[PDB]
Design a protein around this nucleic acid. Sequence first.
RNA 1: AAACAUCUCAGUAUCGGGAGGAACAGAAAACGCAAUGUGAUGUCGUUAGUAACCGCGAGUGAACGCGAUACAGCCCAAACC
RNA 2: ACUCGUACGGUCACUGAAUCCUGCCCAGUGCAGGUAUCUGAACACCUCGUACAAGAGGACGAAGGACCUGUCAACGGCGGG
RNA 3: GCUUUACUGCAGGCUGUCGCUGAGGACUCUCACUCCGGGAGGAGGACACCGAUAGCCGGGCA
Lengths: 56, 92, 237, 194
Amino acid sequence: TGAGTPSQGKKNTTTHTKCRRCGEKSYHTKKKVCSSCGFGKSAKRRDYEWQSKAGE
Amino acid sequence: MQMPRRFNTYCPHCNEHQEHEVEKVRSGRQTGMKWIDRQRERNSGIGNDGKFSKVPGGDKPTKKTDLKYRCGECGKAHLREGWRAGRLEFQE
Amino acid sequence: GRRIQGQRRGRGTSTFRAPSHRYKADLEHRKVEDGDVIAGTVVDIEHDPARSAPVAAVEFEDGDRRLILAPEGVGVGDELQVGVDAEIAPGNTLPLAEIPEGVPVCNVESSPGDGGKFARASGVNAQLLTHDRNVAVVKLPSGEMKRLDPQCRATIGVVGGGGRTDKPFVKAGNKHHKMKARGTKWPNVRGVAMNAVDHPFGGGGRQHPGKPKSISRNAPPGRKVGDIASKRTGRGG
Amino acid sequence: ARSAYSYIREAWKRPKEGQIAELMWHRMQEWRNEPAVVRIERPTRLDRARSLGYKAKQGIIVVRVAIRKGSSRRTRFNKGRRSKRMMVNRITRKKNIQRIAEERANRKFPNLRVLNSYSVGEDGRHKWHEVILIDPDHPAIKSDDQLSWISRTRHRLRTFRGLTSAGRRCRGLRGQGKGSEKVRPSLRVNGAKA
RNA sequence: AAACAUCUCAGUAUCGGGAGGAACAGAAAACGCAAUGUGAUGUCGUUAGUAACCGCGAGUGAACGCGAUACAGCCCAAACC
RNA sequence: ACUCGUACGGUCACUGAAUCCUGCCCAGUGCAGGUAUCUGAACACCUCGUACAAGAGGACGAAGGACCUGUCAACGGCGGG
RNA sequence: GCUUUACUGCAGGCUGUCGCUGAGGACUCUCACUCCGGGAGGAGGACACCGAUAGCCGGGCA
Ligand SMILES: [Cl-]
Ligand SMILES: [Cl-]
Ligand SMILES: [Cl-]
Ligand SMILES: [Cl-]
Ligand SMILES: [K+]
Ligand SMILES: [Mg+2]
Ligand SMILES: [Mg+2]
Ligand SMILES: [Mg+2]
Ligand SMILES: [Mg+2]
Ligand SMILES: [Mg+2]
Ligand SMILES: [Mg+2]
Ligand SMILES: [Mg+2]
Ligand SMILES: [Mg+2]
Ligand SMILES: [Mg+2]
Ligand SMILES: [Mg+2]
Ligand SMILES: [Mg+2]
Ligand SMILES: [Mg+2]
Ligand SMILES: [Mg+2]
Ligand SMILES: [Mg+2]
Ligand SMILES: [Mg+2]
Ligand SMILES: [Mg+2]
Ligand SMILES: [Mg+2]
Ligand SMILES: [Mg+2]
Ligand SMILES: [Mg+2]
Ligand code: NA
Ligand code: NA
Ligand code: NA
Ligand code: NA
Ligand code: NA
Ligand code: NA
Ligand code: NA
Ligand code: NA
Ligand code: NA
Ligand code: NA
Ligand code: NA
């Protein structure tokens, strides 16, 4: 079976959903953790410095 | 080659010819307190220690003459250029 | 390279764990205040998934219902006893001291009360040899002579299910079904059949280990494979 | 005349001698069964505490903290590293155990602030220190002319910024002259070179 | 560093914890133009690519002082109660 | 983790149903065991040195090695004359 | 990427030493410490564990 097109057919699972905390569709409903704001893992909001050029 | 154990020659101290006695420079021993010894202790750490980690050098197929010329009267020695010699044996 | 299979094991992932949730009971000797009065009756004989051997269900006088490591010869209705004064018949448990020398025993405790550690697999048995006020010498199925606290409790008889090893699996399928009831990754791929990156024996244009197969005890995990600290190898001599 | 305190001090100069020696042998046994952070009604070293700022007053807390001995508990590298950085065993943290203690203690008492801390011995693997903490919200401390300074907002979480006792000492700020070129007025401002 | 291991990139990138409107530092167990001298601390200019480091390679790199800015000096512990 | 497990176990490897079989070699390499003697670090100990110290030397000597043995269904070998 | 008796190092294993650590070149004990026991108590015991260091092995890894 091709890992391409023919393997695209089984993708009827729901994972990342609208996050109750930040409103982005990144709340992983299996993990109960948001990939965007960290809701469900961190009380503090997710944020890293590599999200921007070092000097900015 | 052969070399007389004693023979006349210029003494830079006396400033005049006199009988000198020839001896092979015996290697002095180290204190292990010179600057270089401290740097080795100081600078060596976790991982490669740089220069102090190097691989030992080689040897020339023959070494130069390493002698001391001891003046029979004033007792003060002096050094001279050496010269390649597979072996050096003194006579008497 | 990558961790070898021995190193994946350590991680205790699903593939390597034993189906605990499917196991029945942690066969251990009962705890008796003292007196030995404790007795019970054999209510049933069930199969132990963790040991591929029979296990006896017992109802004790004080209402306690527990499974027990059943020695050969135990049946329903039988009465088993546990304590210092327990009778000396198969199926009963009592300190090595109260046990007569020359009698086969199983499920021996290493230290009194631990609930039994030695001789519990199919048809095996220990052999109580010497007594004493201080030491109880027992020969474990491996043939070793084990000096033990005469207080350590043990069960009389030989473990049930003897002879299991006498019949060949015959076919992969049968190993398969057994292996699934254990904490083991199966089947086994030969190191020499792998790539260099995957096992010290992997690589080469043909299959053969790289270096000799006996490895030092000091070898680090990742390298410790093949013949471990072997004292000799082969059959000759 | 010598203060009664001066005796407590004298005894602790050599914690492995005489009476206190047998006291430690006794205590530690109970200590090793105690938690990481245990509040205690009274300082084991009265002279010490009082000397540090302690007072048998409302809003002043003391707690004993257990920290493991030894170098840094470090994980080996999982990627490329030059020899110099392939280190594991001999690496030690730049924060002394006493300071770790201060922090652990402080976290256990979120509303309180660290005043100072002192050692109280150590066995083969532990190290115990007692930390003096203060409730910057309890009047009596707000009204104490000798501690009310710790109630100031500028002091929120002193330990975590190293404004402590051992904090400043650990930051190499002891000397005012030679040696403190890279220490004062702050490690970070000196580009982290001490 | 015309490879590369100490060294360099750099205590940089990035990561963990935390304060404020500014932080941190701060009233000498200092300096050491060695003095009949200076006198808390930051910072700015300079001292200086000086001293010091370093396969003494490549590279790395202060301080006292001086001129300025702004200035500010105090509280416990203990002795005795 | 293996393990609600205990040598009729389980881990680590080689070979790859059955049938007839599986010879010779422990020198090298590996692993293991032993070891009079030899070698073998640091702490403590002794000597020299320094009103201390650096440092030099001595005594003692672990694992290891030398040395000896075992072992090839251990890596492998099984020629020239 | 991979290999090894390439160079340099790093984990890991073994071993000596120090601290925890106590009483009377071999030895007894118990009090720390460890394990077994529900508890009483039993085994072990100043060793082991752990922390520090030293020598050896060390493509498992960089
Ligand atoms: Cl010569
Ligand atoms: Cl099987
Ligand atoms: Cl704080
Ligand atoms: Cl001046
Ligand atoms: K580099
Ligand atoms: Mg793919
Ligand atoms: Mg080094
Ligand atoms: Mg069990
Ligand atoms: Mg079989
Ligand atoms: Mg069948
Ligand atoms: Mg399975
Ligand atoms: Mg296979
Ligand atoms: Mg292949
Ligand atoms: Mg490999
Ligand atoms: Mg083959
Ligand atoms: Mg083969
Ligand atoms: Mg380069
Ligand atoms: Mg600043
Ligand atoms: Mg160059
Ligand atoms: Mg630099
Ligand atoms: Mg200066
Ligand atoms: Mg095949
Ligand atoms: Mg336990
Ligand atoms: Mg490599
Ligand atoms: Na240094
Ligand atoms: Na191979
Ligand atoms: Na706090
Ligand atoms: Na520094
Ligand atoms: Na270059
Ligand atoms: Na290159
Ligand atoms: Na350098
Ligand atoms: Na001047
Ligand atoms: Na051989
Ligand atoms: Na051999
Ligand atoms: Na590649």
